[PDB]
Design an enzyme around this catalytic site. Structure first.
Site, PDB file in Angstrom:
ATOM      1  N   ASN A 111     -25.199 -30.095 -19.293  1.00 50.36           N
ATOM      2  CA  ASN A 111     -26.666 -30.305 -19.275  1.00 50.36           C
ATOM      3  C   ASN A 111     -26.910 -31.717 -18.755  1.00 50.36           C
ATOM      4  O   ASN A 111     -26.286 -32.659 -19.274  1.00 50.36           O
ATOM      5  CB  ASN A 111     -27.278 -30.051 -20.654  1.00 50.36           C
ATOM      6  CG  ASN A 111     -28.794 -29.929 -20.688  1.00 50.36           C
ATOM      7  OD1 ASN A 111     -29.402 -30.109 -21.744  1.00 50.36           O
ATOM      8  ND2 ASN A 111     -29.427 -29.599 -19.579  1.00 50.36           N
ATOM      9  N   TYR A 157     -41.193 -34.724 -15.611  1.00 50.41           N
ATOM     10  CA  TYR A 157     -40.553 -34.671 -16.939  1.00 50.41           C
ATOM     11  C   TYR A 157     -40.897 -35.941 -17.720  1.00 50.41           C
ATOM     12  O   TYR A 157     -40.885 -37.048 -17.129  1.00 50.41           O
ATOM     13  CB  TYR A 157     -39.057 -34.442 -16.730  1.00 50.41           C
ATOM     14  CG  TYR A 157     -38.212 -34.525 -17.972  1.00 50.41           C
ATOM     15  CD1 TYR A 157     -38.214 -33.502 -18.891  1.00 50.41           C
ATOM     16  CD2 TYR A 157     -37.382 -35.612 -18.213  1.00 50.41           C
ATOM     17  CE1 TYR A 157     -37.405 -33.548 -20.016  1.00 50.41           C
ATOM     18  CE2 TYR A 157     -36.577 -35.682 -19.336  1.00 50.41           C
ATOM     19  CZ  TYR A 157     -36.595 -34.648 -20.249  1.00 50.41           C
ATOM     20  OH  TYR A 157     -35.831 -34.683 -21.384  1.00 50.41           O
ATOM     21  N   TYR A 185     -42.606 -30.614 -19.401  1.00 54.32           N
ATOM     22  CA  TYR A 185     -42.177 -30.252 -18.031  1.00 54.32           C
ATOM     23  C   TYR A 185     -43.363 -29.741 -17.221  1.00 54.32           C
ATOM     24  O   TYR A 185     -44.152 -28.918 -17.708  1.00 54.32           O
ATOM     25  CB  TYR A 185     -41.162 -29.115 -18.058  1.00 54.32           C
ATOM     26  CG  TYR A 185     -39.892 -29.395 -18.813  1.00 54.32           C
ATOM     27  CD1 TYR A 185     -39.848 -29.307 -20.190  1.00 54.32           C
ATOM     28  CD2 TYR A 185     -38.724 -29.706 -18.142  1.00 54.32           C
ATOM     29  CE1 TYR A 185     -38.678 -29.544 -20.886  1.00 54.32           C
ATOM     30  CE2 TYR A 185     -37.537 -29.918 -18.823  1.00 54.32           C
ATOM     31  CZ  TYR A 185     -37.517 -29.845 -20.198  1.00 54.32           C
ATOM     32  OH  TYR A 185     -36.369 -30.099 -20.877  1.00 54.32           O
TER      33      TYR A 185
END
Lengths: 192, 193, 192
Positions: B47, B79, B90
């Protein structure tokens, strides 16, 4: 001093007030306890006034009461800035005409549980806290009429700034009633 | 000054804030280039999320241009975070093989910058965040059709969210970011006001 | 002489040509023998055109002649691909602005006796051969001005691919003159 009929400003019940009429027709404007004022007008030319603050700015404005009109009137938080000179309006309700007639549409903002349409319009050689001047008007106008609630001025000022509508040094800011060639009544209490 | 980096950090470069974060799974390179420009390349990543923008978010017209490619689960999104309360948010313009956040939490729509977006609210339970392990909401605008390049008017998104009862706290950072989950790809993104 | 002033495409001298102007100010585009064209523009908005090939691709393009501007114009091999949609330039010379102003530098390539700097940039909702579209532009721009020489398109295409700048199915490819809010003139002969 309680009810008045000539353009003035001052302090009453721990609050600032401003009241202005072009003198056309008749308007009475009453100063009651704390943040309260009442107004009554008939076939008036142009008038605007209420209670609030000598120095505007970022504030959660709470107000309550009643507003009625057979014609073109509104209920708005109303203020000025200098450098530059701006006349501004957060209109919560109106009568036969939704201001400012869709002219200068800029976009939207969502504040205090409601949507507002944002407009810029212009006054050339008009009365102003600095005289006969040319200046911009900044508008937030609720999409549905409401009478009573909070107005978070900050949200409006941030929205306006994001649309390119910049404010100067704050002059007065009041929870106002307004008449144009109309008749009606209002009974409004302002607080923080 | 550093150019390409591979470890989580925040800083200033080219007159812009940047944030870069990776859990350390797989490979991600993040390159700081002139002005509002960053590039990224990732391979079989765990991630990661990062970009350039502003240390303090808020209503802003965010102009970006550039490229975004993935063979997997990645997206391209304005973001940021608020604190008090804690919100990860987002505004997703593009994605790979998974349109986030997979239909979960639909609230309504909003039209901004020539495109329709769907609005969603989701929750993260004891998850990494700018205040460490915490529980918090995610707010999403997700474009109906993929776009790479254009303007994101954040006010339209912040307005629409608040109207669906999704309220922001105090603005932390706001960046034009690239994110990858168990995916590969690259991006080349230049941000400006 | 067959000179034109209105956007169009066709065949002349056994070459394809393209000519496009947004219609701002004045541009004359003249079709002469073989691969030759001339152009003349004054106080123009935006124009681009030249002679070449209806179907671009890997080619040794040779061109000769003159190019003069008092402002922002350039001289470039110029084409399009579809699927994806790409507009591309191999710029040999320019006037007051070296395109594309440093935006989206990717690296370099040596072709035809010269270093070119490679740029990728993007056009969002803009005029193109398919209409209003979003698309990438690929640039090779010569480090030093040159008017006349060979342009080996494959050397440029191969370098673009190496930087992840991938091309579609070739539309047209022409040795173009381009003006942007400029005046100037060109006389260019193209060949294989």
């Amino acid at each position: 001093q309680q009810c008045i009929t000539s353009s003035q400003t001052g302090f009453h019940g721990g609050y600032f007030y401003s009241f202005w009429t072009d003198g056309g027709g008749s308007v009475s404007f009453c100063l009651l306890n704390g943040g309260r004022y009442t107004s009554q007008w008939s076939n008036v030319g142009n008038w605007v006034g209420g209670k609030g603050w000598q120095t505007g700015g970022r504030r959660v404005v709470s107000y309550s009461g009643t507003f009625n009109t057979s014609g073109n009137s509104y209920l708005a938080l109303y203020g000025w800035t200098t450098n530059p000179l701006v006349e501004y309006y957060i209109v919560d309700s109106w009568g036969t005409w939704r201001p400012p007639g869709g002219e200068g549409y800029m976009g939207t903002v969502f504040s205090d549980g409601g949507w507002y349409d944002v407009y810029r319009t212009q006054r050339v050689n008009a009365p102003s806290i600095e005289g006969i001047r040319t200046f911009y008007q900044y508008w937030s106008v609720r999409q549905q009429k409401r009478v009573g609630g909070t107005i978070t001025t900050g949200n409006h000022f941030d929205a306006w700034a994001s649309y390119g509508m910049n404010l100067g040094t704050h002059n007065y800011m009041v929870m106002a009633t307004e008449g144009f060639q109309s008749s009606g009544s209002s009974d409004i209490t302002v607080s923080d």
